[PDB]
Amino acid sequence: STIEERVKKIIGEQLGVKQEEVTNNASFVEDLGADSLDTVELVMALEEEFDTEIPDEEAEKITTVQAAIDYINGHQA
Ligand SMILES: *P(=O)(O)OCC(C)(C)[C@@H](O)C(=O)NCCC(=O)NCCSC(=O)CCCCCCCCC
Ligand SMILES: [Zn+2]
Ligand SMILES: [Zn+2]
Ligand SMILES: [Zn+2]
Ligand SMILES: [Zn+2]
Ligand SMILES: [Zn+2]
Ligand SMILES: [Zn+2]
Ligand SMILES: [Zn+2]
């Protein structure tokens, strides 16, 4: 499978949203309805899957599904 597929699956699982709703342009807060706690738990779930650590101040600025995919392609090793 692809990174896009793996990342979207975790986002849908974490936020309780259906797959067809997890588009690449979608914003986590406005479009997918992520709340304060969701922000924290979603960041940690992806950090674990992709064995990486993102700085909280940088995570806070990753607003869309595609921005999250982009960060993982750039930092996963
Ligand atoms: P709550 O009211 O206490 O907190 C609400 C607010 C103040 C909105 C905070 O969530 C906050 O800091 N908001 C800043 C603007 C905003 O909505 N930013 C967040 C978008 S969602 C998010 O942070 C999830 C990112 C997931 C992708 C990261 C994956 C990287 C893994 C390596
Ligand atoms: Zn594959
Ligand atoms: Zn596939
Ligand atoms: Zn929905
Ligand atoms: Zn949008
Ligand atoms: Zn909640
Ligand atoms: Zn953190
Ligand atoms: Zn690795």
PDB file of N, CA and C and ligand atoms in Angstrom:
ATOM      1  N   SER A   1       0.855  -1.205   0.000  1.00  0.00           N
ATOM      2  CA  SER A   1       0.000   0.000   0.000  1.00  0.00           C
ATOM      3  C   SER A   1       0.877   1.236   0.000  1.00  0.00           C
ATOM      4  N   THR A   2       0.265   2.402  -0.122  1.00  0.00           N
ATOM      5  CA  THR A   2       1.018   3.640  -0.160  1.00  0.00           C
ATOM      6  C   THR A   2       0.949   4.419   1.147  1.00  0.00           C
ATOM      7  N   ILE A   3       1.820   5.416   1.281  1.00  0.00           N
ATOM      8  CA  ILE A   3       1.825   6.241   2.491  1.00  0.00           C
ATOM      9  C   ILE A   3       0.461   6.954   2.610  1.00  0.00           C
ATOM     10  N   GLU A   4      -0.022   7.439   1.480  1.00  0.00           N
ATOM     11  CA  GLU A   4      -1.308   8.120   1.440  1.00  0.00           C
ATOM     12  C   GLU A   4      -2.372   7.211   2.045  1.00  0.00           C
ATOM     13  N   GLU A   5      -2.385   5.942   1.648  1.00  0.00           N
ATOM     14  CA  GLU A   5      -3.375   5.009   2.164  1.00  0.00           C
ATOM     15  C   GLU A   5      -3.234   4.734   3.643  1.00  0.00           C
ATOM     16  N   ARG A   6      -1.995   4.592   4.100  1.00  0.00           N
ATOM     17  CA  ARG A   6      -1.769   4.312   5.497  1.00  0.00           C
ATOM     18  C   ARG A   6      -2.116   5.504   6.375  1.00  0.00           C
ATOM     19  N   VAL A   7      -1.707   6.695   5.940  1.00  0.00           N
ATOM     20  CA  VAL A   7      -1.985   7.891   6.689  1.00  0.00           C
ATOM     21  C   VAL A   7      -3.495   8.147   6.755  1.00  0.00           C
ATOM     22  N   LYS A   8      -4.192   8.046   5.626  1.00  0.00           N
ATOM     23  CA  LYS A   8      -5.643   8.266   5.629  1.00  0.00           C
ATOM     24  C   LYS A   8      -6.403   7.285   6.505  1.00  0.00           C
ATOM     25  N   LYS A   9      -5.941   6.040   6.561  1.00  0.00           N
ATOM     26  CA  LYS A   9      -6.603   5.052   7.395  1.00  0.00           C
ATOM     27  C   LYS A   9      -6.510   5.471   8.868  1.00  0.00           C
ATOM     28  N   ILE A  10      -5.323   5.865   9.314  1.00  0.00           N
ATOM     29  CA  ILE A  10      -5.133   6.288  10.710  1.00  0.00           C
ATOM     30  C   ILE A  10      -5.958   7.549  11.049  1.00  0.00           C
ATOM     31  N   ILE A  11      -6.028   8.497  10.119  1.00  0.00           N
ATOM     32  CA  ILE A  11      -6.811   9.714  10.337  1.00  0.00           C
ATOM     33  C   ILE A  11      -8.304   9.376  10.528  1.00  0.00           C
ATOM     34  N   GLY A  12      -8.807   8.469   9.698  1.00  0.00           N
ATOM     35  CA  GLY A  12     -10.207   8.084   9.764  1.00  0.00           C
ATOM     36  C   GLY A  12     -10.531   7.351  11.033  1.00  0.00           C
ATOM     37  N   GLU A  13      -9.618   6.477  11.420  1.00  0.00           N
ATOM     38  CA  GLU A  13      -9.764   5.707  12.638  1.00  0.00           C
ATOM     39  C   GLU A  13      -9.752   6.647  13.856  1.00  0.00           C
ATOM     40  N   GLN A  14      -8.737   7.503  13.937  1.00  0.00           N
ATOM     41  CA  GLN A  14      -8.593   8.428  15.040  1.00  0.00           C
ATOM     42  C   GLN A  14      -9.762   9.401  15.201  1.00  0.00           C
ATOM     43  N   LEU A  15     -10.168  10.029  14.101  1.00  0.00           N
ATOM     44  CA  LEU A  15     -11.234  11.013  14.158  1.00  0.00           C
ATOM     45  C   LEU A  15     -12.662  10.477  14.038  1.00  0.00           C
ATOM     46  N   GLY A  16     -12.819   9.172  13.816  1.00  0.00           N
ATOM     47  CA  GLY A  16     -14.150   8.612  13.667  1.00  0.00           C
ATOM     48  C   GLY A  16     -14.843   9.079  12.394  1.00  0.00           C
ATOM     49  N   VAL A  17     -14.077   9.311  11.335  1.00  0.00           N
ATOM     50  CA  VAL A  17     -14.674   9.776  10.099  1.00  0.00           C
ATOM     51  C   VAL A  17     -14.520   8.723   9.035  1.00  0.00           C
ATOM     52  N   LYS A  18     -15.507   8.646   8.141  1.00  0.00           N
ATOM     53  CA  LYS A  18     -15.487   7.660   7.064  1.00  0.00           C
ATOM     54  C   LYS A  18     -14.444   7.981   6.002  1.00  0.00           C
ATOM     55  N   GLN A  19     -13.821   6.929   5.468  1.00  0.00           N
ATOM     56  CA  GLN A  19     -12.787   7.066   4.454  1.00  0.00           C
ATOM     57  C   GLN A  19     -13.029   8.028   3.305  1.00  0.00           C
ATOM     58  N   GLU A  20     -14.215   7.962   2.708  1.00  0.00           N
ATOM     59  CA  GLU A  20     -14.565   8.813   1.577  1.00  0.00           C
ATOM     60  C   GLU A  20     -14.532  10.300   1.886  1.00  0.00           C
ATOM     61  N   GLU A  21     -14.525  10.622   3.179  1.00  0.00           N
ATOM     62  CA  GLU A  21     -14.500  11.993   3.667  1.00  0.00           C
ATOM     63  C   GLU A  21     -13.065  12.520   3.871  1.00  0.00           C
ATOM     64  N   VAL A  22     -12.098  11.599   3.968  1.00  0.00           N
ATOM     65  CA  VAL A  22     -10.695  11.948   4.178  1.00  0.00           C
ATOM     66  C   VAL A  22      -9.963  12.265   2.860  1.00  0.00           C
ATOM     67  N   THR A  23     -10.332  13.384   2.240  1.00  0.00           N
ATOM     68  CA  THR A  23      -9.692  13.821   1.001  1.00  0.00           C
ATOM     69  C   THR A  23      -8.354  14.487   1.324  1.00  0.00           C
ATOM     70  N   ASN A  24      -7.552  14.730   0.292  1.00  0.00           N
ATOM     71  CA  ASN A  24      -6.236  15.336   0.475  1.00  0.00           C
ATOM     72  C   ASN A  24      -6.277  16.820   0.836  1.00  0.00           C
ATOM     73  N   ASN A  25      -7.256  17.539   0.307  1.00  0.00           N
ATOM     74  CA  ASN A  25      -7.387  18.958   0.617  1.00  0.00           C
ATOM     75  C   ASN A  25      -8.030  19.240   1.994  1.00  0.00           C
ATOM     76  N   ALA A  26      -8.703  18.249   2.578  1.00  0.00           N
ATOM     77  CA  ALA A  26      -9.421  18.449   3.839  1.00  0.00           C
ATOM     78  C   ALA A  26      -8.629  18.954   5.027  1.00  0.00           C
ATOM     79  N   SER A  27      -9.158  19.974   5.708  1.00  0.00           N
ATOM     80  CA  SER A  27      -8.500  20.517   6.886  1.00  0.00           C
ATOM     81  C   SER A  27      -8.899  19.672   8.103  1.00  0.00           C
ATOM     82  N   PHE A  28      -7.957  19.403   8.996  1.00  0.00           N
ATOM     83  CA  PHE A  28      -8.303  18.577  10.157  1.00  0.00           C
ATOM     84  C   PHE A  28      -9.412  19.149  11.044  1.00  0.00           C
ATOM     85  N   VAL A  29      -9.322  20.445  11.343  1.00  0.00           N
ATOM     86  CA  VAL A  29     -10.299  21.108  12.198  1.00  0.00           C
ATOM     87  C   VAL A  29     -11.599  21.434  11.464  1.00  0.00           C
ATOM     88  N   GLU A  30     -11.562  22.405  10.547  1.00  0.00           N
ATOM     89  CA  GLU A  30     -12.798  22.789   9.878  1.00  0.00           C
ATOM     90  C   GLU A  30     -13.529  21.679   9.140  1.00  0.00           C
ATOM     91  N   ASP A  31     -12.836  20.959   8.256  1.00  0.00           N
ATOM     92  CA  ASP A  31     -13.498  19.911   7.461  1.00  0.00           C
ATOM     93  C   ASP A  31     -13.719  18.573   8.161  1.00  0.00           C
ATOM     94  N   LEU A  32     -12.752  18.122   8.952  1.00  0.00           N
ATOM     95  CA  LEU A  32     -12.921  16.825   9.586  1.00  0.00           C
ATOM     96  C   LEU A  32     -13.393  16.884  11.033  1.00  0.00           C
ATOM     97  N   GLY A  33     -13.527  18.100  11.546  1.00  0.00           N
ATOM     98  CA  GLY A  33     -14.023  18.287  12.896  1.00  0.00           C
ATOM     99  C   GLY A  33     -13.165  17.830  14.069  1.00  0.00           C
ATOM    100  N   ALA A  34     -11.850  17.811  13.907  1.00  0.00           N
ATOM    101  CA  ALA A  34     -10.980  17.389  15.001  1.00  0.00           C
ATOM    102  C   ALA A  34     -11.046  18.341  16.195  1.00  0.00           C
ATOM    103  N   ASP A  35     -11.225  17.823  17.419  1.00  0.00           N
ATOM    104  CA  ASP A  35     -11.216  18.721  18.579  1.00  0.00           C
ATOM    105  C   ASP A  35      -9.844  18.878  19.262  1.00  0.00           C
ATOM    106  N   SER A  36      -9.776  19.597  20.386  1.00  0.00           N
ATOM    107  CA  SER A  36      -8.493  19.824  21.055  1.00  0.00           C
ATOM    108  C   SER A  36      -7.765  18.512  21.345  1.00  0.00           C
ATOM    109  N   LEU A  37      -8.456  17.551  21.943  1.00  0.00           N
ATOM    110  CA  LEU A  37      -7.822  16.269  22.252  1.00  0.00           C
ATOM    111  C   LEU A  37      -7.416  15.472  21.010  1.00  0.00           C
ATOM    112  N   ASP A  38      -8.243  15.542  19.974  1.00  0.00           N
ATOM    113  CA  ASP A  38      -7.978  14.823  18.719  1.00  0.00           C
ATOM    114  C   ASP A  38      -6.654  15.269  18.141  1.00  0.00           C
ATOM    115  N   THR A  39      -6.376  16.558  18.247  1.00  0.00           N
ATOM    116  CA  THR A  39      -5.140  17.098  17.717  1.00  0.00           C
ATOM    117  C   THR A  39      -3.958  16.302  18.289  1.00  0.00           C
ATOM    118  N   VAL A  40      -3.903  16.229  19.619  1.00  0.00           N
ATOM    119  CA  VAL A  40      -2.839  15.537  20.362  1.00  0.00           C
ATOM    120  C   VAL A  40      -2.720  14.052  20.046  1.00  0.00           C
ATOM    121  N   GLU A  41      -3.840  13.337  20.142  1.00  0.00           N
ATOM    122  CA  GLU A  41      -3.872  11.909  19.881  1.00  0.00           C
ATOM    123  C   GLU A  41      -3.594  11.531  18.433  1.00  0.00           C
ATOM    124  N   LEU A  42      -3.987  12.385  17.487  1.00  0.00           N
ATOM    125  CA  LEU A  42      -3.709  12.078  16.082  1.00  0.00           C
ATOM    126  C   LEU A  42      -2.216  12.240  15.827  1.00  0.00           C
ATOM    127  N   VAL A  43      -1.610  13.292  16.396  1.00  0.00           N
ATOM    128  CA  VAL A  43      -0.181  13.486  16.212  1.00  0.00           C
ATOM    129  C   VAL A  43       0.592  12.295  16.745  1.00  0.00           C
ATOM    130  N   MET A  44       0.276  11.869  17.957  1.00  0.00           N
ATOM    131  CA  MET A  44       1.004  10.743  18.519  1.00  0.00           C
ATOM    132  C   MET A  44       0.798   9.407  17.791  1.00  0.00           C
ATOM    133  N   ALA A  45      -0.391   9.187  17.215  1.00  0.00           N
ATOM    134  CA  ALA A  45      -0.665   7.937  16.495  1.00  0.00           C
ATOM    135  C   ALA A  45       0.174   7.834  15.216  1.00  0.00           C
ATOM    136  N   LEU A  46       0.398   8.970  14.557  1.00  0.00           N
ATOM    137  CA  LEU A  46       1.187   8.968  13.326  1.00  0.00           C
ATOM    138  C   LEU A  46       2.674   8.926  13.685  1.00  0.00           C
ATOM    139  N   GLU A  47       3.052   9.573  14.789  1.00  0.00           N
ATOM    140  CA  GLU A  47       4.464   9.526  15.221  1.00  0.00           C
ATOM    141  C   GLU A  47       4.861   8.073  15.485  1.00  0.00           C
ATOM    142  N   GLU A  48       3.947   7.309  16.059  1.00  0.00           N
ATOM    143  CA  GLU A  48       4.234   5.901  16.357  1.00  0.00           C
ATOM    144  C   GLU A  48       4.271   5.026  15.126  1.00  0.00           C
ATOM    145  N   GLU A  49       3.319   5.211  14.203  1.00  0.00           N
ATOM    146  CA  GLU A  49       3.276   4.368  13.005  1.00  0.00           C
ATOM    147  C   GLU A  49       4.506   4.573  12.169  1.00  0.00           C
ATOM    148  N   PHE A  50       4.899   5.827  12.043  1.00  0.00           N
ATOM    149  CA  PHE A  50       6.032   6.123  11.200  1.00  0.00           C
ATOM    150  C   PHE A  50       7.344   6.362  11.943  1.00  0.00           C
ATOM    151  N   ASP A  51       7.373   5.957  13.209  1.00  0.00           N
ATOM    152  CA  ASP A  51       8.577   5.990  14.065  1.00  0.00           C
ATOM    153  C   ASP A  51       9.343   7.307  13.927  1.00  0.00           C
ATOM    154  N   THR A  52       8.631   8.419  14.171  1.00  0.00           N
ATOM    155  CA  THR A  52       9.254   9.737  14.064  1.00  0.00           C
ATOM    156  C   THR A  52       8.706  10.671  15.162  1.00  0.00           C
ATOM    157  N   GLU A  53       9.314  11.841  15.312  1.00  0.00           N
ATOM    158  CA  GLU A  53       8.847  12.796  16.310  1.00  0.00           C
ATOM    159  C   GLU A  53       8.780  14.157  15.662  1.00  0.00           C
ATOM    160  N   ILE A  54       7.599  14.749  15.655  1.00  0.00           N
ATOM    161  CA  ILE A  54       7.487  16.096  15.108  1.00  0.00           C
ATOM    162  C   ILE A  54       7.346  17.148  16.244  1.00  0.00           C
ATOM    163  N   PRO A  55       8.038  18.307  16.124  1.00  0.00           N
ATOM    164  CA  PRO A  55       7.934  19.356  17.159  1.00  0.00           C
ATOM    165  C   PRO A  55       6.480  19.881  17.222  1.00  0.00           C
ATOM    166  N   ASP A  56       5.937  19.988  18.440  1.00  0.00           N
ATOM    167  CA  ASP A  56       4.560  20.432  18.648  1.00  0.00           C
ATOM    168  C   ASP A  56       4.239  21.734  17.913  1.00  0.00           C
ATOM    169  N   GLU A  57       5.176  22.680  17.908  1.00  0.00           N
ATOM    170  CA  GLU A  57       4.908  23.951  17.237  1.00  0.00           C
ATOM    171  C   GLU A  57       4.840  23.777  15.719  1.00  0.00           C
ATOM    172  N   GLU A  58       5.461  22.717  15.191  1.00  0.00           N
ATOM    173  CA  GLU A  58       5.387  22.491  13.755  1.00  0.00           C
ATOM    174  C   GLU A  58       4.135  21.676  13.436  1.00  0.00           C
ATOM    175  N   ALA A  59       3.754  20.790  14.348  1.00  0.00           N
ATOM    176  CA  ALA A  59       2.559  19.960  14.146  1.00  0.00           C
ATOM    177  C   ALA A  59       1.302  20.825  14.116  1.00  0.00           C
ATOM    178  N   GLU A  60       1.295  21.827  14.980  1.00  0.00           N
ATOM    179  CA  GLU A  60       0.187  22.748  15.129  1.00  0.00           C
ATOM    180  C   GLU A  60      -0.122  23.487  13.806  1.00  0.00           C
ATOM    181  N   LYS A  61       0.856  23.529  12.900  1.00  0.00           N
ATOM    182  CA  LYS A  61       0.731  24.221  11.620  1.00  0.00           C
ATOM    183  C   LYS A  61       0.464  23.315  10.388  1.00  0.00           C
ATOM    184  N   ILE A  62       0.330  22.001  10.622  1.00  0.00           N
ATOM    185  CA  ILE A  62       0.024  21.023   9.577  1.00  0.00           C
ATOM    186  C   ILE A  62      -1.494  20.932   9.563  1.00  0.00           C
ATOM    187  N   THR A  63      -2.103  21.742   8.699  1.00  0.00           N
ATOM    188  CA  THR A  63      -3.556  21.887   8.658  1.00  0.00           C
ATOM    189  C   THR A  63      -4.410  20.942   7.814  1.00  0.00           C
ATOM    190  N   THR A  64      -3.820  20.298   6.808  1.00  0.00           N
ATOM    191  CA  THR A  64      -4.582  19.414   5.915  1.00  0.00           C
ATOM    192  C   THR A  64      -4.004  18.009   5.875  1.00  0.00           C
ATOM    193  N   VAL A  65      -4.794  17.078   5.356  1.00  0.00           N
ATOM    194  CA  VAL A  65      -4.368  15.675   5.186  1.00  0.00           C
ATOM    195  C   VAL A  65      -3.074  15.667   4.345  1.00  0.00           C
ATOM    196  N   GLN A  66      -3.069  16.390   3.230  1.00  0.00           N
ATOM    197  CA  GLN A  66      -1.880  16.384   2.364  1.00  0.00           C
ATOM    198  C   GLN A  66      -0.624  16.919   3.066  1.00  0.00           C
ATOM    199  N   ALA A  67      -0.783  17.920   3.938  1.00  0.00           N
ATOM    200  CA  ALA A  67       0.368  18.465   4.665  1.00  0.00           C
ATOM    201  C   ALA A  67       0.976  17.403   5.603  1.00  0.00           C
ATOM    202  N   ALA A  68       0.124  16.544   6.167  1.00  0.00           N
ATOM    203  CA  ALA A  68       0.569  15.472   7.049  1.00  0.00           C
ATOM    204  C   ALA A  68       1.323  14.429   6.218  1.00  0.00           C
ATOM    205  N   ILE A  69       0.784  14.080   5.052  1.00  0.00           N
ATOM    206  CA  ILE A  69       1.452  13.105   4.161  1.00  0.00           C
ATOM    207  C   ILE A  69       2.832  13.675   3.754  1.00  0.00           C
ATOM    208  N   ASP A  70       2.827  14.937   3.334  1.00  0.00           N
ATOM    209  CA  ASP A  70       4.064  15.602   2.940  1.00  0.00           C
ATOM    210  C   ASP A  70       5.145  15.565   4.018  1.00  0.00           C
ATOM    211  N   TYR A  71       4.775  15.792   5.279  1.00  0.00           N
ATOM    212  CA  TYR A  71       5.742  15.781   6.376  1.00  0.00           C
ATOM    213  C   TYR A  71       6.319  14.379   6.561  1.00  0.00           C
ATOM    214  N   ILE A  72       5.452  13.374   6.534  1.00  0.00           N
ATOM    215  CA  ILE A  72       5.921  11.988   6.696  1.00  0.00           C
ATOM    216  C   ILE A  72       6.859  11.588   5.535  1.00  0.00           C
ATOM    217  N   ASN A  73       6.522  11.933   4.291  1.00  0.00           N
ATOM    218  CA  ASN A  73       7.435  11.586   3.181  1.00  0.00           C
ATOM    219  C   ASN A  73       8.783  12.253   3.369  1.00  0.00           C
ATOM    220  N   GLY A  74       8.797  13.420   4.028  1.00  0.00           N
ATOM    221  CA  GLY A  74      10.048  14.132   4.231  1.00  0.00           C
ATOM    222  C   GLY A  74      10.892  13.712   5.425  1.00  0.00           C
ATOM    223  N   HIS A  75      10.274  13.099   6.422  1.00  0.00           N
ATOM    224  CA  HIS A  75      11.024  12.746   7.611  1.00  0.00           C
ATOM    225  C   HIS A  75      11.097  11.266   7.960  1.00  0.00           C
ATOM    226  N   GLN A  76      10.212  10.425   7.433  1.00  0.00           N
ATOM    227  CA  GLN A  76      10.291   8.994   7.809  1.00  0.00           C
ATOM    228  C   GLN A  76      11.547   8.346   7.290  1.00  0.00           C
ATOM    229  N   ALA A  77      12.161   7.505   8.118  1.00  0.00           N
ATOM    230  CA  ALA A  77      13.396   6.805   7.755  1.00  0.00           C
ATOM    231  C   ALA A  77      13.288   5.326   8.070  1.00  0.00           C
TER     232      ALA A  77
HETATM  233  P1  LIG B   1      -8.274  23.334  22.437  1.00  0.00           P
HETATM  234  O1  LIG B   1      -9.293  24.467  22.292  1.00  0.00           O
HETATM  235  O2  LIG B   1      -7.654  23.364  23.825  1.00  0.00           O
HETATM  236  O3  LIG B   1      -7.140  23.656  21.457  1.00  0.00           O
HETATM  237  C1  LIG B   1      -7.776  24.174  20.335  1.00  0.00           C
HETATM  238  C2  LIG B   1      -6.704  24.893  19.501  1.00  0.00           C
HETATM  239  C3  LIG B   1      -6.266  26.207  20.245  1.00  0.00           C
HETATM  240  C4  LIG B   1      -7.370  25.260  18.206  1.00  0.00           C
HETATM  241  C5  LIG B   1      -5.458  23.999  19.290  1.00  0.00           C
HETATM  242  O4  LIG B   1      -5.870  22.751  18.718  1.00  0.00           O
HETATM  243  C6  LIG B   1      -4.396  24.683  18.375  1.00  0.00           C
HETATM  244  O5  LIG B   1      -3.207  24.753  18.729  1.00  0.00           O
HETATM  245  N1  LIG B   1      -4.838  25.181  17.208  1.00  0.00           N
HETATM  246  C7  LIG B   1      -4.014  25.863  16.173  1.00  0.00           C
HETATM  247  C8  LIG B   1      -4.771  25.963  14.725  1.00  0.00           C
HETATM  248  C9  LIG B   1      -5.152  24.555  14.395  1.00  0.00           C
HETATM  249  O6  LIG B   1      -6.337  24.179  14.302  1.00  0.00           O
HETATM  250  N2  LIG B   1      -4.107  23.716  14.191  1.00  0.00           N
HETATM  251  C10 LIG B   1      -4.316  22.294  14.015  1.00  0.00           C
HETATM  252  C11 LIG B   1      -4.763  21.503  12.902  1.00  0.00           C
HETATM  253  S1  LIG B   1      -5.033  19.707  13.390  1.00  0.00           S
HETATM  254  C12 LIG B   1      -3.546  18.906  13.963  1.00  0.00           C
HETATM  255  O7  LIG B   1      -2.721  19.516  14.638  1.00  0.00           O
HETATM  256  C13 LIG B   1      -3.330  17.445  13.588  1.00  0.00           C
HETATM  257  C14 LIG B   1      -2.085  17.233  12.774  1.00  0.00           C
HETATM  258  C15 LIG B   1      -1.918  15.783  12.399  1.00  0.00           C
HETATM  259  C16 LIG B   1      -0.759  15.620  11.432  1.00  0.00           C
HETATM  260  C17 LIG B   1       0.571  15.472  12.136  1.00  0.00           C
HETATM  261  C18 LIG B   1       1.229  14.160  11.744  1.00  0.00           C
HETATM  262  C19 LIG B   1       2.735  14.223  11.902  1.00  0.00           C
HETATM  263  C20 LIG B   1       3.265  12.884  12.347  1.00  0.00           C
HETATM  264  C21 LIG B   1       4.700  12.751  12.114  1.00  0.00           C
HETATM  265 ZN    ZN B   2       2.776  -0.833  -0.999  1.00  0.00          ZN
HETATM  266 ZN    ZN B   3      -3.883   0.290  -2.436  1.00  0.00          ZN
HETATM  267 ZN    ZN B   4     -18.320  12.268   8.629  1.00  0.00          ZN
HETATM  268 ZN    ZN B   5     -11.262  22.608   3.390  1.00  0.00          ZN
HETATM  269 ZN    ZN B   6     -12.933  14.804  21.588  1.00  0.00          ZN
HETATM  270 ZN    ZN B   7       4.090  16.093  20.584  1.00  0.00          ZN
HETATM  271 ZN    ZN B   8      11.585   3.282   9.520  1.00  0.00          ZN
END
